[PDB]
Every structure is written in C-alpha cells, then in structure tokens.
Swiss-Prot record:
<keyword id="KW-0812">Transmembrane</keyword>
<keyword id="KW-1043">Host membrane</keyword>
<dbReference type="GO" id="GO:0001907">
    <property type="term" value="P:symbiont-mediated killing of host cell"/>
</dbReference>
<keyword id="KW-0472">Membrane</keyword>
<keyword id="KW-1133">Transmembrane helix</keyword>
<dbReference type="GO" id="GO:0005576">
    <property type="term" value="C:extracellular region"/>
</dbReference>
<dbReference type="GO" id="GO:0020002">
    <property type="term" value="C:host cell plasma membrane"/>
</dbReference>
<dbReference type="GO" id="GO:0075118">
    <property type="term" value="P:symbiont-mediated perturbation of host G protein-coupled receptor signal transduction pathway"/>
</dbReference>
<dbReference type="GO" id="GO:0090729">
    <property type="term" value="F:toxin activity"/>
</dbReference>
<protein>
    <recommendedName>
        <fullName>Dermonecrotic toxin</fullName>
    </recommendedName>
</protein>
<dbReference type="GO" id="GO:0044071">
    <property type="term" value="P:symbiont-mediated perturbation of host cell cycle progression"/>
</dbReference>
<dbReference type="GO" id="GO:0005543">
    <property type="term" value="F:phospholipid binding"/>
</dbReference>
<keyword id="KW-0964">Secreted</keyword>
<dbReference type="GO" id="GO:0004620">
    <property type="term" value="F:phospholipase activity"/>
</dbReference>
<keyword id="KW-0843">Virulence</keyword>
<keyword id="KW-0800">Toxin</keyword>
<dbReference type="GO" id="GO:0005737">
    <property type="term" value="C:cytoplasm"/>
</dbReference>
Length: 711
C-alpha cells in the first residue's frame, strides 16, 4: 500500500479548506484578489491536487510561510481571520496531537517553505515508523545553529535577466545600497586616478579591471542590479590582503569589491542578505541531506581495528623508535598511507624526504586546505602545465600567508615535477569561520571524510594526506564520537615537532565523545518501543494461500547450502514428532497454551530454544472500533537464526491441505500471519508471550487507525 488510509502519516486533507471555501471566507467587499492572495489560492489548489505525500506536506509548509509573510506585510488586513484559520488547519493536518514538542521545534525555524521543515517532518515520521535511525533531534540542533537555515530570509526573490550566462547565487537588487555604507572607497589612494563620486560609481570599474586579470569573472551589473556566481566561501578564501595587496599579482580591486559587499551585509548573514531564494532553498535542503549522511557515517563505527594497530599507549614510542626511513617504508608498504598535520613544518619534512616516499610507491598527495568543488579542474590545469588556474593561485597565496615560496605551493609544485597525483579533499560549503559551533564543525569535517573515503582508500594506492588536527583524529559528534580521516582510512596521524621530530599524533580520549546537549523543549522520544512495525498499511495475501511449496524457498535461502540438508532433517523431525502433533490446535487464541508446550518439547528433542516471537495488529470491529489481535510462537535456534514452530496457525485462514505445524524463519512467519489475517499496522516483538502479556499485547498506540480532523 503506497499511501494507506490506516497510516497515521497519510497527511489527509479532510480538515483543510479548498480554494473555493477560502474565497467565500476571505472575501471582502470592494477588495479584489491581490497578488499575494492569488498565489495563496494557487498553492492551496496544488496541495489538494497533490498525490505524492512528501510533496503535499512540502507544499503545505510553503503555504504556512506565505500566510506568515502576508500576516507580517498586511497586519491590519481583514482577510487575516480566514488565513489564520487555514494556517492552523495546515499545522493540525501535518502535526498529530502527540507531536506537540516536534511541531514547536520545527515551526520555530524561520522560512517554513525553505525545505527545512519538510525535511525535518519527513525524518521525524520515518523515525517514528522505525524506518530511519534516531536523528531528528540532532538535525533540529544543526538547523537551529546554522547561519543559513536559522536565518529569516532577506535576500532576492525577483527574476534573473536572460543575458547572464552563469548560474546566479547572490543578487544585490539596488546598487545604491553601496553608497549608504560608512567607508568611502572612492576616496582611497588607489582610486584617485578614477575620479569617482561614490562607491556605486567605482563598482562597474572594479569588476571590469578584475575581470581582465582573471578574477571576478562571474559578476555582472544589469540595470542597477549586481548578479554574482562566485560562492561566499570561494571569494573569502581567494580574496584577502595576502592575495590582493597594493601592486600585487591580483591588485586591490577584488578585495575592495568583497570588502564593501561585507559592509552592505551589516550584521546579517551573507546568504540571508544577498542569496537568491532559489539558491537559498537549495542550500538549506542540501546542507540537511549532507549532515544526515555524515551522522549516518558515524553510526556504529568500530574503533577496534584502528585501536588494535595505533591505539596502544606506547605506539608513539614504537613509531619514534624506528628510523625515519623505516617509518616511511612502514607507512607506504604496510599502512599504505600516512597523514600529517597541515603545518609548513610537516610539509617541509615531507618534501625533504620525498624521494624516499616515491621509491616506496607513493601515488598520491591529498590536502583538505583546498576545496575540490572549486579548484579541482584548476589543479589539473596546473599539473598539465596549462595556465587557467587563477583561483587556485590566489588560494595558495592565502594559505601561504602571501609567501612566494610557501609550503602549500611547494607541495603542489613537487607533485607536478615528480608526476605524483594531487587531490583537494576539502569542500567549500560552510567552510568560512568562526567554527564556534560543534555542528558546523561536524558538517564540514563530514564532507571532507566522505570525499576521502571515496577517493583515497583504494587497493592500488599509497597516499599522503595533509589536514587540520580537528580533521585527522576524533571530534565530538551526534550522540557518539565523530572519527577522523585517519580512523576511517586505517592510517596514523602525525606531526612534525618545532625541532624536526616526526611523531605520532594520538587520538586522545577527551575528543572521542558525543557533543554536549540539552534536551530540546519538552522533547519526546520518536523511535518505536522495541521490536518492529512491519508496515503502516493493511497486509494482504499477494499470491493466494501459502503452501509448503511456496515456503520451501524461504527455508532453503535462510541458511547456507552446506547446512541446508540438516535444517530440512530438523524440520522433518519436528513435523513427524508424535508429541508435537499432540499439541496441534486450531482454536482461536490457542497459541497461549500451545506455544510453551512446543518450547518444552523442542528442548526434549535436543534442539536449542529460541526466544520466540509475537505479532499483534489492529482489526476493524463493528461501529468504527478497532480491536487488537495477537499471536505468539515458540522457536528453535539454528545457524544463528530463529525458526518459528507454530502448532496453532490453522486457527487462521489457510490452504485446504496445509501442514498442521508451521515452520519458517521468524520474519517470514510474521509476514505470513499478518497477510493471512489481513492485519492493519502489525507489530512484532521477538519474544514469545503468555497470559496477560499476550492478552494485552498491542501495537504502538499512535498506529491505531484514527479519523482525520475535522472540520
Ligand atoms: O510567522 C509567525 C510566527 O511563526 C512561528 O510561531 C508560531 O509557531 C510556534 C510553534 O508552533 C508557536 O509557538 C507560536 O505560537 C506560533 O505563532 C515562529 O516561531 C515565529 O518566529 C513567527 O513570528
Ligand atoms: O530584503 C528585505 C526583505 O526580505 C524579505 O523579502 C524577501 O523574501 C521573500 C520570501 O522569499 C520574498 O517574498 C520577497 O519578495 C523578498 O524581497 C522579507 O520578507 C521582507 O520583510 C524584507 O523587507
């Protein structure tokens, strides 16, 4: 069932007004339908025409924002009674009564139609359904601190001129905002020969001159509006006094352009102030996608393999005891890789010993201090001897503090001359400081690790990585530690001392922790109790009654081929046991007394007892009531798997010739029982139950089918 009427998450529209009902409710005498209101009406229609439930709830969140905006811009509008009513209906259609705390957290985030609320509700519902792991609270925490997601949108929503040939990220709509800032950049010594009245008058010149030198190529002014295709982070790491001093390789013009952008920005966020809404919404939803993958990556990470090699208290001494050349040989031929802290000292040491590394099969050098999403093609240009690498070059001046030599530049140079592959593993997004928040840090680290896993641990590779200490070893994560590049790649992290000692960098215990959290306001746990919701639908027989014929593949595929014949022997033994056939019952509810007798007989036959299993579900009763129905079974253990032995299954609808004792892997047993009973929202616990504990065993209460509000 792709959208069951029995699911609590069906997002039903029964209690949400249609456009025509709204018209009559929001009609005011002498006031024709304005443009805000006509887009509110079109959004409502889309909601009612929406078949895809995820999209529907997305559109509903969008409508809530439009109503928020209308309410803010028209505080005395007489249409506000109807709109406030509609907004409440949308909240109640999306957020069930038991979701109050979730609702409060999600709807406090600004810009309800930005994609954050859509993502958070999707995640919350999957978490409650037991289809995703525990993640919602932490994603809410990430969202609340993020300078893009948690910012009320103040950017550009207008159209983009068609003459622009680059994808636009930021727009300054009215150029005259530059003339409103504190600093007179037109009065600067470097612009006396320009003789310009104001900042906005400098602007066309600043672009034109930088544009020729290679920089700022994705900036265009059309009709008093400035359009930008360079990312905030790209600009920050390629434009500074280190790369843009007076009379330098890239002059002053980019730095002045960026400096006054930041002044116009004020104490708003960059994206909050200048971003296109399209680009804003894309950023919000991609940040959340990526943080989710990062968190998933930390889940159940096993430190045992790494600690087994590098985690002994004295590994530092065993590393130090070796000669420098013995370490290089070990790192290259045994570990297949090593990582250095991103200091110039470490780079210098590496370069001083480069021949030794190459002779032992070094194939690649990787650094996190450059963003592949910006400069990877330009890096390839450098290596191919070509000249189209201006942004790369400017970023190297920044990394090298404006030095002509500089460790990072030397590193790139050696890779070219020695035919070693060079890779950037940094990602530009969310990479600009301050890193005063563990979630921003974790997000940034996670993207670098994902790239490194993808590109670096490949069987025919011997690599060296240069990265920040925070990226190399473990850091605080979401409910658990966030492991470093080095743990993920199965390598050691190293530093070079101030007096040239190449030493191991231990993963300290204080870093291998969860991020410190306060519980969110009134927060309730979302994940289901214990056991499993099979599905939020009505289960049905797909292909008629099950038979021993149909069950055979389920039994044979449950175990390896060399164990197949022993399982069948055990199943034959059970089905042809005299005391087992005595226990057979087709009375309604008989599993209560039968199941324990089965467990006792299995024991006496010399089989290993399993935990058993129980299934419970809702059943439509007379007069719109739903009762709970349940069934339990004993099991045996074989090859680390549990097999139901169900001698009371014939109380349920069955094939005419069917066996009296049902034997299937527990998961196949549950499905069969659910389908034969046409079970609504069935729930399995992997224990057999008896007496009161069977008689009142029911699914999670939020799954009991209910009517939608109302109106
Ligand atoms: O745009 C209006 C306001 O919307 C949000 O506040 C609403 O939603 C909260 C959570 O459900 C409620 O606590 C609150 O009573 C509602 O008004 C948002 O949190 C505010 O910042 C907006 O001003
Ligand atoms: O630039 C200041 C204004 O920012 C917001 O308005 C922008 O964002 C809205 C939602 O995307 C658009 O509808 C609107 O056209 C944009 O200008 C904010 O809503 C306003 O209060 C500010 O004046």
């Amino acid at each position: 069932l792709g959208g069951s009427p029995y699911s609590p998450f069906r997002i039903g529209l029964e209690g949400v007004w249609t456009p025509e009902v709204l018209k009559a409710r929001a009609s005011v005498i002498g006031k024709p339908i304005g443009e805000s209101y006509k887009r509110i009406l079109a959004k409502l229609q889309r909601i009612h025409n929406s078949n895809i439930l995820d999209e529907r709830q997305g559109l509903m969140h969008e409508l809530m924002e439009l109503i928020d905006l209308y309410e803010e811009s028209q505080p005395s509008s007489e249409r506000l009674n109807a709109f406030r009513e509609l907004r409440t209906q949308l909240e109640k259609a999306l957020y069930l009564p038991e979701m109050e705390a979730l609702k409060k957290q999600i709807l406090q985030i600004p810009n309800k139609g930005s994609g954050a609320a859509r993502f958070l509700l999707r995640t919350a519902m999957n978490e409650m359904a037991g289809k995703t792991s525990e993640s919602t609270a932490d994603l809410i925490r990430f969202a609340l601190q993020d300078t893009v997601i948690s910012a009320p949108f103040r950017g550009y929503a207008g159209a983009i001129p068609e003459a622009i040939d680059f994808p636009v990220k930021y727009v300054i709509e009215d150029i005259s905002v530059f003339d409103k800032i504190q600093t007179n950049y037109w009065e600067l010594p470097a612009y006396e020969s320009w003789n310009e009245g104001s900042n906005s008058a400098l602007l066309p010149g600043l672009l034109r001159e930088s544009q020729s030198k290679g920089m700022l190529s994705k900036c265009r002014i059309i009709e008093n509006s400035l359009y930008i295709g360079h990312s905030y982070e790209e600009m920050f790491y390629s434009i500074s006094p280190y790369s843009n001093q007076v009379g330098g390789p890239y002059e002053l013009y980019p730095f002045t352009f960026f400096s006054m952008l930041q002044e116009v920005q004020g104490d708003l966020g960059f994206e909050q102030a200048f971003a296109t809404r399209n680009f804003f919404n894309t950023l919000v939803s991609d940040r959340l996608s990526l943080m989710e993958n990062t968190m998933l990556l930390t889940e159940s990470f096993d430190y045992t393999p790494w600690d087994a090699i590098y985690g002994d208290i004295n590994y530092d001494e065993q590393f130090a005891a070796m000669s420098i050349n013995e370490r290089i040989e070990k790192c290259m031929n045994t570990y297949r890789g090593v990582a250095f802290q991103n200091s110039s000292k470490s780079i210098d040491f590496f370069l001083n010993n480069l021949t030794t590394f190459i002779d032992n099969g070094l194939t690649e050098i990787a650094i996190s201090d450059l963003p592949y999403d910006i400069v990877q093609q330009e890096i390839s240009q450098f290596l191919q001897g070509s000249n189209e690498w201006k942004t790369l070059d400017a970023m190297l001046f920044n990394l090298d503090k404006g030095d002509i030599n500089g460790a990072f530049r030397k590193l790139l140079q050696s890779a070219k001359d020695n035919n070693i592959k060079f890779r950037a593993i940094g990602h530009s997004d969310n990479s600009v400081p301050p890193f005063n928040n563990p979630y921003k840090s974790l997000y940034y680290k996670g993207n670098i690790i994902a790239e490194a896993i993808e590109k670096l641990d490949r069987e025919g590779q011997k690599f060296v990585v240069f990265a920040d200490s925070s990226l190399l070893n473990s850091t605080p994560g979401t409910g658990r530690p966030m492991p470093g590049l080095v743990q993920y790649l199965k390598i050691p992290a190293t530093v070079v001392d101030s007096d040239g000692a190449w030493q191991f960098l231990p993963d300290v215990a204080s870093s291998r922790v969860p991020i410190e959290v306060t519980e969110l306001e009134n927060w309730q746990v979302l994940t289901p109790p214990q056991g499993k919701i099979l599905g939020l639908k009505q289960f049905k027989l797909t292909a008629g009654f099950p038979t021993e014929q149909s069950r055979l593949p389920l039994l044979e595929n449950s175990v390896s081929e060399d164990l197949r014949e022993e399982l069948m022997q055990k199943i034959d033994a059970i089905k042809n046991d005299v005391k087992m056939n005595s226990l057979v019952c087709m009375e309604a509810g008989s599993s209560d007394s039968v199941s324990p007798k089965v467990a006792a007989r299995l024991k006496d036959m010399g089989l290993e007892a399993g935990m058993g299993a129980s299934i419970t579900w809702w059943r439509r009763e007379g007069g719109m009531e739903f009762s709970h129905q349940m069934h339990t079974t004993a099991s045996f253990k074989f090859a680390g798997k549990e097999f139901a032995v169900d001698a009371s299954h014939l109380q349920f609808v069955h094939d005419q010739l069917d066996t009296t004792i049902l034997i299937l892997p527990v998961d196949d047993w549950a499905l069969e029982i659910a389908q034969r009973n046409r079970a609504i929202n069935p729930f399995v616990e992997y224990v057999s139950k008896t007496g009161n504990m069977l008689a009142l065993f029911m699914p999670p209460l939020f799954t009991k089918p209910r009517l939608t509000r109302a109106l």
